[PDB]
Amino acid sequence: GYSFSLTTFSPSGKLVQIEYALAAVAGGAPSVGIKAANGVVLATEKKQKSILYDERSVHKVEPITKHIGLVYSGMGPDYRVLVHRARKLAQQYYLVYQEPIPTAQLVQRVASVMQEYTQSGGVRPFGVSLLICGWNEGRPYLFQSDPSGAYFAWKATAMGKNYVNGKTFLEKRYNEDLELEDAIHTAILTLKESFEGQMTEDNIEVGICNEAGFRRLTPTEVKDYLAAIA
Amino acid sequence: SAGFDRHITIFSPEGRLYQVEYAFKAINQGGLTSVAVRGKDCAVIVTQKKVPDKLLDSSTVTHLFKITENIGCVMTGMTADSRSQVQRARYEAANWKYKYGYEIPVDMLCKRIADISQVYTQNAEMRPLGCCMILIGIDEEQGPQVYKCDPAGYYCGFKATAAGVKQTESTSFLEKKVKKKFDWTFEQTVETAITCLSTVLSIDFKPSEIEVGVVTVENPKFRILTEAEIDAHLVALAE
Amino acid sequence: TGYDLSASTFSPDGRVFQVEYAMKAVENSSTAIGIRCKDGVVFGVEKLVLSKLYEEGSNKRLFNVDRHVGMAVAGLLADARSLADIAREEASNFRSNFGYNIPLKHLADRVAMYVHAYTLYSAVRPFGCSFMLGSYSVNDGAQLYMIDPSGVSYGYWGCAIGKARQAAKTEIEKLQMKEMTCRDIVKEVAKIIYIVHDEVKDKAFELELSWVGELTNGRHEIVPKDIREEAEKYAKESLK
Amino acid sequence: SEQIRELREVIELPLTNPELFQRVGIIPPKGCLLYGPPGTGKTLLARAVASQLDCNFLKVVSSSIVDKYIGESARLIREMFNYARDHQPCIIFMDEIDAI
Amino acid sequence: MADGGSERADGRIVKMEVDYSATVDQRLPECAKLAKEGRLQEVIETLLSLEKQTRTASDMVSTSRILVAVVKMCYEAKEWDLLNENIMLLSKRRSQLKQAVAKMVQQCCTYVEEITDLPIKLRLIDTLRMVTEGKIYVEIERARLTKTLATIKEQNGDVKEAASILQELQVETYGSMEKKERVEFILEQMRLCLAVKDYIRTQIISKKINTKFFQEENTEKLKLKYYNLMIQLDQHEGSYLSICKHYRAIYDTPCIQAESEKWQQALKSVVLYVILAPFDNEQSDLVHRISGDKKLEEIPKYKD
Amino acid sequence: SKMNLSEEVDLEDYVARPDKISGADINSICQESGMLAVRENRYIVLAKDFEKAYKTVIKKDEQEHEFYK
Amino acid sequence: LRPGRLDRKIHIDLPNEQARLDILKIHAGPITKHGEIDYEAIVKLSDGFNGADLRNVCTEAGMFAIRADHDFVVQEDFMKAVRKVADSKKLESKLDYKPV
Amino acid sequence: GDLVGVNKDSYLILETLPTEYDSRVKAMEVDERPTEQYSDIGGLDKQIQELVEAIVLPMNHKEKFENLGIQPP
Amino acid sequence: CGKTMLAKAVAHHTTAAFIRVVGSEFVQKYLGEGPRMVRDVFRLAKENAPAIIFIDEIDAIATKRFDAQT
Ligand SMILES: [Mg+2]
């Protein structure tokens, strides 16, 4: 192999170290995100290695502004860097324009941050992909960045381990028009496809977007939502 | 197999990197084990000492380190990397009081520590400090807490805690220990903190071979136990 | 081993050999011991004459950092000279910012963190020196410290640095050092040097004894054992 | 003293009692892994298992069977069973399982 | 060193009645502080066994009466506290507590014909607490077994005492089987299993016996007479040819033990139901072996 | 079928479980509970060991360093 | 690691500091002496940490008995033997070996 | 292992004639007896003792390895 | 998932000459022995009965995907 480095090409194809960085994304915790007709639902998987770990200490669904949330699938230590980057970057729009930043504008800029660590030549890229949600100007949005620097606009997707089983699930599942309450029902039902044995109120962690702003769900509702609703 | 990324900090094919996870086995050259236990409104650190010389002193050996007046810690791993980690912990604890005007939470401090350990993984050209840190502290409206920072930049707060050489044997004891709903009335905490380390190491130690740091919600100051009252808790469990 | 070039790389089992290689470079240097009594610290260095043209007091290994602080270096001598100038410069800023003498517990922390910084980057190498720090005060008593090339620094009652690190501390620990005076220590340091290989397979040597404590009123200076020559008179009687 | 016996009945009870292996029904409890130092443990506590019956021993050098095409090696399996067929449970002592 | 504790124990055995026995327990923690020292050779195991001997001898005098509770509460006192007394991390398990209580289970063998059943099983239920921990490894491994057999013969055996011995069988193969007495203990429980009418478990624990044979040379009336209960196991279903092979195995010893009634009924019992086995080649040549006997013509079933 | 279980302990409580098991490890479960009764001197499986043999072989996620999830 | 190849595994440890004295008195067996020996005074001064190498310690103590014409073995000869044998153990490289 | 004399055609043992060697082994015995002393060798004083303690003393003292009761390699 | 067991189940209720070969003993050294062991199987097979040749694993060498300039 040529690869060994980031500042040169292969004689045939593309940059190989960015492809190896995507392998760490696929070996992460699974996640799912569904864009409904009135909101976007984020849901992820969160299991401790033991019964000793306090579950209410470190969170996965993480708000950026009062209408923008964000999840990941990769390495949590690299995740905390670009979250703190995206917080301070979102305030710089608000100091200039005095207006809450639209969701298509962070993804212009957050991907340009993940761009810059793919430069020369002694730094490493991230090993984290993202999912960014928000309800700006009526219509809600659901995007996805990558360590290479590109981005998307999804109807529904799933990252992490066993994403091909969740994708063929959602290809057979996701329709165009449902409410947010039906969207969470098919967002846990796709998390049950690749989860482990027990699924309690602490194994999952779910956040939503209304038009009334971003909100993450406390385990009182999530216990009552997973209570026999499939 | 790899082989590939085993000199510097770049990726492997599928999918990890090895220089950070070689620091996880860089703790084990200390030859030491530390245990932290949170059961109820108090919090207990316990760690043995190993003095191999009579010319060697006693006061300059202790791994219990007072960060602020209400926050104490213990250090494992190799010795020289541990103390430079403490110097950053003492420094940024005072910047919080200067910038923000109040006492720093124990939760907020491990964010500031693991982010410094994060840059050394992301950006290269500095050895990533092969030591581990365990914190305790009292929080208002939250009770006592126990946190652990990792050399990779990971942190998680959790109730019963082991480190050093014998994590997988001590945590296996504490999973079976913290499953019954017994209360933890400040001597149920200490006696389990002794007998877990006492059976995993298989030492059942003589009184002058350990250290015990404590904090409690009746006196939130960090407190290192006197050698006399260490004997008092040792004669308490073996009645 | 190949995985041992830089100081910023780890072995597959988890240690840095560049620190390990620099430790046993101190092993090839001659023995320098240190000891403290109840009211002072007494140094002592076995130092060998190179050929003959040495001029009786050159290139010494008993330095003088502060008014009450000195060193007892061993290893690469040129690397210890640059390290001694750091401790001279560090104690000056504590005077200019706080107005009183540097405590030895705080001085050894500032030096050992500076030695630690040369064990992290690939541009620089770790030091090849180990040394002693002895001081005396009226509010703190006498202290004696010990710094390896890795940067681990804590206190002893007695120590040795050189070839005979183990072979000297065997007979240091059979002394009742907790109650002796540091005038009786000086005649006892000289026999520890002359037992273990002063000129047996080597050519020649010369003894140096540094000295700090209550009798010097906190000053650090060399012994007046050119006066009355009592160290060699008492230690050479231990031939049988 | 703990390992004289922990290895004893994990070998003794399956060979002495194959009838319990039809009271529920499974044939292979096929032995422990003795790993650690060279020391004296590999050669001496093998003679501790020799205390009752045992005997057999023979020897497995872990080298004369490891020839590359395994059409010979499968015959070199059953070549050693030409004496292991001559008895009751023969006890094939096997040295340097993993050593080339 | 510890001879002062012996001459103080010389004082307390005189002052068991002159002074009150709680003062013997007040001179006791000084001897515990001597055991707390226990450094290298001065006040260590050999002299520690002497205070352990004399504190048990004082426990003998104090609880020879029906005030039994002092010897028991002194035991959970010291045997929980010995982890703090002598050496930490599993001190010796070597003559620091063993013969002090191996004497006491020998005393429980003495008092069982004198003391009634109630305070001796209170004595046994308090010594089972530390026998489950250690002290029955070897010499004496049957400190448990000479008293758990006593618990069987308290109420002289039932379903529970058969369960009480089956749970404690292999713990002295976990200590060291005794060529003879271990075989004599590991046989005894299956006649209790026959009392609970257990037959499949009985032959499993009977198959352990078969490799320890030819010790009937030094055994007069025990080895080939317990196997008269092994035919009771094969009495059950049909195995008539096997227990005629058995009778020829127990045929030998009453010809060594030259009897003319016990040995003659061995000829009587074997000649009855070789017939009752189904016909085989094995029956056809066995009758060709046992006929032509010089002893068979004593009985008119030579005609049969 | 070719194993004397002989209890009233229903196995389908382990059919309905998640934590998908490879077909070779089903063979490991029934053989381990065979060991986990005979070694304790039982002539029949009592299927109180069958819980422990199930929980033994399912624990294969060994270390993962609590890192990169 | 399936049931049927390595059904249960067990690790052998190198030190005990008290099973030294077991293996020591085995190798301090058929060697002529007075019964003068404080065998624990050997063990506390011994740092061998290998059962096959404590066999070498009793071998070289007889070499010190060949020295100075000792048909017996004095207690000093074992203390001479530890300083020769255990120092020779310290002067060898390649100290990474672990069974998996 | 005997070097017997056997008839050609009959293949029958006739004589015994044992212990016969070729000239190549007889040339391997040293009749030179060189003149090297231990004073000529320098710098190997540890290995000089460890050779004499291993080979020379079993050549000389057969009984010193008997009354002590060990085995020389 | 029960792969080799299915190959063993065919070998019972067939009337063929079952041949199982691991895909690892011909990736060895001694340049030229590898491709001849492939010939040694089929010359032994086509001389014989209706036969089954079960190669166990080729998750070893099964893929070209580049021109080897090595
Ligand atoms: Mg297969």
Short mmCIF file of N, CA, C and O in Angstrom, two decimals, chain D residues 5 8-9 12-13 52, chain E residues 136-138 140-146 148-149 164-190 205-206 208-212 215 219 222-223 226-227, chain F residues 41:
data_model
loop_
_atom_site.label_atom_id
_atom_site.label_comp_id
_atom_site.label_asym_id
_atom_site.label_seq_id
_atom_site.Cartn_x
_atom_site.Cartn_y
_atom_site.Cartn_z
N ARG D 5 -5.30 -30.90 42.56
CA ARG D 5 -6.61 -31.53 42.62
C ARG D 5 -7.60 -30.93 41.63
O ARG D 5 -8.48 -31.64 41.14
N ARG D 8 -7.10 -32.82 38.88
CA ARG D 8 -7.30 -34.25 39.11
C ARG D 8 -8.68 -34.74 38.68
O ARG D 8 -8.79 -35.54 37.74
N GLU D 9 -9.74 -34.26 39.32
CA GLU D 9 -11.07 -34.79 39.04
C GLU D 9 -11.69 -34.23 37.76
O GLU D 9 -12.72 -34.75 37.32
N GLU D 12 -10.19 -37.22 36.10
CA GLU D 12 -10.52 -38.51 36.70
C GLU D 12 -11.99 -38.87 36.51
O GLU D 12 -12.31 -39.94 36.00
N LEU D 13 -12.88 -37.97 36.94
CA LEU D 13 -14.32 -38.20 36.82
C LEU D 13 -14.84 -38.45 35.39
O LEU D 13 -15.78 -39.25 35.26
N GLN D 52 -2.48 -41.92 40.51
CA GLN D 52 -3.44 -43.00 40.43
C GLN D 52 -3.36 -43.46 38.97
O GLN D 52 -3.33 -42.62 38.07
N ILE E 136 -10.22 -28.06 58.17
CA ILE E 136 -10.52 -29.46 57.92
C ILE E 136 -9.79 -29.91 56.66
O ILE E 136 -10.25 -30.81 55.95
N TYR E 137 -8.64 -29.29 56.39
CA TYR E 137 -7.91 -29.59 55.17
C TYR E 137 -7.28 -30.98 55.25
O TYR E 137 -7.74 -31.89 54.56
N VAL E 138 -6.30 -31.16 56.13
CA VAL E 138 -5.72 -32.48 56.40
C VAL E 138 -5.01 -32.40 57.75
O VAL E 138 -4.45 -31.35 58.11
N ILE E 140 -6.37 -32.63 61.17
CA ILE E 140 -7.31 -33.71 60.85
C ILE E 140 -8.36 -33.20 59.85
O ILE E 140 -8.99 -32.16 60.06
N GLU E 141 -8.51 -33.91 58.74
CA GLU E 141 -9.51 -33.54 57.75
C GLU E 141 -10.91 -33.92 58.21
O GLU E 141 -11.90 -33.37 57.73
N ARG E 142 -11.00 -34.86 59.15
CA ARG E 142 -12.27 -35.37 59.65
C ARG E 142 -12.67 -34.70 60.95
O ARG E 142 -13.40 -35.31 61.74
N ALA E 143 -12.19 -33.48 61.20
CA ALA E 143 -12.76 -32.67 62.26
C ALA E 143 -14.21 -32.33 61.95
O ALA E 143 -15.04 -32.23 62.86
N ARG E 144 -14.54 -32.16 60.67
CA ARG E 144 -15.93 -32.09 60.26
C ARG E 144 -16.60 -33.46 60.31
O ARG E 144 -17.74 -33.58 60.76
N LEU E 145 -15.89 -34.51 59.88
CA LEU E 145 -16.57 -35.77 59.60
C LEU E 145 -16.87 -36.55 60.87
O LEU E 145 -17.84 -37.31 60.91
N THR E 146 -16.06 -36.39 61.91
CA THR E 146 -16.38 -37.07 63.16
C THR E 146 -17.50 -36.39 63.92
O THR E 146 -18.02 -36.97 64.87
N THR E 148 -20.05 -34.38 61.91
CA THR E 148 -21.23 -34.42 61.06
C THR E 148 -21.82 -35.82 60.99
O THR E 148 -23.01 -35.98 60.68
N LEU E 149 -21.02 -36.84 61.30
CA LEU E 149 -21.57 -38.17 61.53
C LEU E 149 -22.31 -38.22 62.86
O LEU E 149 -23.28 -38.97 63.01
N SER E 164 -27.67 -34.10 54.54
CA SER E 164 -26.60 -33.42 55.25
C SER E 164 -25.24 -34.06 54.99
O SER E 164 -24.21 -33.39 55.12
N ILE E 165 -25.21 -35.34 54.64
CA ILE E 165 -23.93 -35.97 54.34
C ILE E 165 -23.60 -35.92 52.85
O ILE E 165 -22.43 -35.78 52.49
N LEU E 166 -24.61 -35.95 51.97
CA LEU E 166 -24.36 -35.88 50.53
C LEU E 166 -23.83 -34.51 50.11
O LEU E 166 -23.13 -34.41 49.09
N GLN E 167 -24.14 -33.47 50.86
CA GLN E 167 -23.60 -32.14 50.58
C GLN E 167 -22.18 -31.97 51.08
O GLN E 167 -21.52 -30.99 50.70
N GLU E 168 -21.68 -32.89 51.90
CA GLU E 168 -20.35 -32.77 52.49
C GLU E 168 -19.45 -33.94 52.15
O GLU E 168 -18.46 -34.18 52.86
N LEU E 169 -19.77 -34.70 51.10
CA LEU E 169 -18.99 -35.89 50.74
C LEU E 169 -17.57 -35.58 50.30
O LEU E 169 -16.61 -35.92 51.00
N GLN E 170 -17.43 -34.90 49.17
CA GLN E 170 -16.16 -34.80 48.48
C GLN E 170 -15.23 -33.74 49.06
O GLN E 170 -14.19 -33.46 48.46
N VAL E 171 -15.56 -33.18 50.22
CA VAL E 171 -14.77 -32.10 50.80
C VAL E 171 -13.48 -32.66 51.41
O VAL E 171 -12.52 -31.91 51.66
N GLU E 172 -13.41 -33.96 51.63
CA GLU E 172 -12.20 -34.57 52.15
C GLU E 172 -11.48 -35.43 51.12
O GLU E 172 -10.34 -35.83 51.36
N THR E 173 -12.10 -35.69 49.96
CA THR E 173 -11.30 -35.84 48.76
C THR E 173 -10.78 -34.49 48.29
O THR E 173 -9.78 -34.44 47.57
N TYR E 174 -11.43 -33.40 48.71
CA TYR E 174 -10.86 -32.07 48.58
C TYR E 174 -9.83 -31.77 49.65
O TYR E 174 -9.22 -30.69 49.63
N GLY E 175 -9.63 -32.68 50.60
CA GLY E 175 -8.52 -32.55 51.52
C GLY E 175 -7.43 -33.58 51.33
O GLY E 175 -6.25 -33.26 51.43
N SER E 176 -7.83 -34.82 51.06
CA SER E 176 -6.87 -35.90 50.85
C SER E 176 -7.45 -37.24 51.28
O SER E 176 -7.45 -37.58 52.46
N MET E 177 -7.94 -38.00 50.30
CA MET E 177 -8.53 -39.31 50.57
C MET E 177 -7.57 -40.20 51.35
O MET E 177 -6.38 -40.29 51.02
N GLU E 178 -8.08 -40.85 52.39
CA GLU E 178 -7.27 -41.73 53.22
C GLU E 178 -7.42 -43.19 52.78
O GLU E 178 -8.48 -43.79 52.96
N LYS E 179 -6.36 -43.75 52.21
CA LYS E 179 -6.38 -45.13 51.76
C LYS E 179 -7.53 -45.93 52.37
O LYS E 179 -8.21 -46.68 51.66
N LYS E 180 -7.77 -45.78 53.67
CA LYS E 180 -8.76 -46.63 54.33
C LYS E 180 -9.95 -45.87 54.87
O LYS E 180 -11.09 -46.16 54.48
N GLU E 181 -9.73 -44.89 55.75
CA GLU E 181 -10.83 -44.23 56.45
C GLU E 181 -11.64 -43.35 55.51
O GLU E 181 -12.86 -43.21 55.70
N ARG E 182 -11.01 -42.80 54.47
CA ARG E 182 -11.76 -42.06 53.46
C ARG E 182 -12.66 -42.99 52.66
O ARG E 182 -13.79 -42.63 52.33
N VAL E 183 -12.16 -44.19 52.36
CA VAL E 183 -13.00 -45.20 51.72
C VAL E 183 -14.11 -45.63 52.67
O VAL E 183 -15.27 -45.79 52.26
N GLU E 184 -13.80 -45.74 53.96
CA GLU E 184 -14.80 -46.11 54.95
C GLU E 184 -15.84 -45.02 55.17
O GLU E 184 -16.96 -45.30 55.58
N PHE E 185 -15.48 -43.76 54.91
CA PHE E 185 -16.50 -42.72 55.01
C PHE E 185 -17.31 -42.61 53.73
O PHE E 185 -18.52 -42.40 53.78
N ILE E 186 -16.66 -42.76 52.57
CA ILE E 186 -17.36 -42.56 51.30
C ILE E 186 -18.20 -43.77 50.92
O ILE E 186 -18.97 -43.70 49.95
N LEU E 187 -18.12 -44.86 51.68
CA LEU E 187 -19.09 -45.92 51.50
C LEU E 187 -20.37 -45.67 52.30
O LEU E 187 -21.45 -46.03 51.83
N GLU E 188 -20.26 -45.00 53.45
CA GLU E 188 -21.29 -45.06 54.48
C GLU E 188 -22.57 -44.33 54.08
O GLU E 188 -23.65 -44.69 54.56
N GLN E 189 -22.48 -43.34 53.20
CA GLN E 189 -23.65 -42.51 52.92
C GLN E 189 -24.68 -43.18 52.03
O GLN E 189 -25.82 -42.71 51.98
N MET E 190 -24.33 -44.25 51.31
CA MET E 190 -25.27 -44.76 50.32
C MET E 190 -26.27 -45.74 50.94
O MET E 190 -27.33 -45.97 50.35
N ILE E 205 -22.10 -43.07 43.40
CA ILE E 205 -21.12 -42.92 44.47
C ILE E 205 -20.56 -44.26 44.92
O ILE E 205 -19.62 -44.29 45.72
N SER E 206 -21.10 -45.38 44.43
CA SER E 206 -20.50 -46.68 44.68
C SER E 206 -19.40 -47.02 43.69
O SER E 206 -18.54 -47.86 44.00
N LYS E 208 -17.01 -45.12 42.79
CA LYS E 208 -15.76 -44.56 43.28
C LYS E 208 -14.94 -45.59 44.07
O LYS E 208 -13.71 -45.47 44.15
N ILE E 209 -15.60 -46.62 44.60
CA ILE E 209 -14.97 -47.57 45.51
C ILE E 209 -13.99 -48.49 44.78
O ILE E 209 -12.92 -48.82 45.31
N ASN E 210 -14.32 -48.86 43.53
CA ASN E 210 -13.80 -50.07 42.88
C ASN E 210 -12.29 -50.10 42.69
O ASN E 210 -11.72 -51.19 42.59
N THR E 211 -11.63 -48.95 42.63
CA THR E 211 -10.18 -48.96 42.42
C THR E 211 -9.39 -49.20 43.70
O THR E 211 -8.22 -49.58 43.62
N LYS E 212 -9.99 -48.99 44.87
CA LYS E 212 -9.31 -49.24 46.14
C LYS E 212 -9.76 -50.61 46.65
O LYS E 212 -10.70 -50.74 47.44
N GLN E 215 -7.53 -54.18 50.35
CA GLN E 215 -7.26 -53.78 51.73
C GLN E 215 -8.05 -54.61 52.73
O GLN E 215 -8.07 -54.28 53.92
N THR E 219 -8.15 -56.01 57.08
CA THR E 219 -9.52 -55.71 57.49
C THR E 219 -10.24 -57.01 57.82
O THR E 219 -10.39 -57.88 56.95
N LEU E 222 -14.96 -55.74 57.95
CA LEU E 222 -15.57 -54.51 57.45
C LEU E 222 -15.58 -54.40 55.93
O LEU E 222 -16.53 -53.83 55.37
N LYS E 223 -14.56 -54.90 55.24
CA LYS E 223 -14.38 -54.61 53.82
C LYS E 223 -15.38 -55.37 52.96
O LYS E 223 -16.20 -54.77 52.26
N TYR E 226 -19.45 -54.81 53.90
CA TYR E 226 -20.26 -53.70 53.42
C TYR E 226 -20.85 -53.99 52.05
O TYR E 226 -21.91 -53.45 51.72
N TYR E 227 -20.22 -54.87 51.28
CA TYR E 227 -20.73 -55.23 49.96
C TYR E 227 -21.99 -56.08 50.03
O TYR E 227 -22.64 -56.29 49.00
N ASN F 41 -22.04 -33.17 40.57
CA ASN F 41 -22.56 -34.50 40.90
C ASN F 41 -24.09 -34.54 40.88
O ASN F 41 -24.76 -34.73 41.90
#
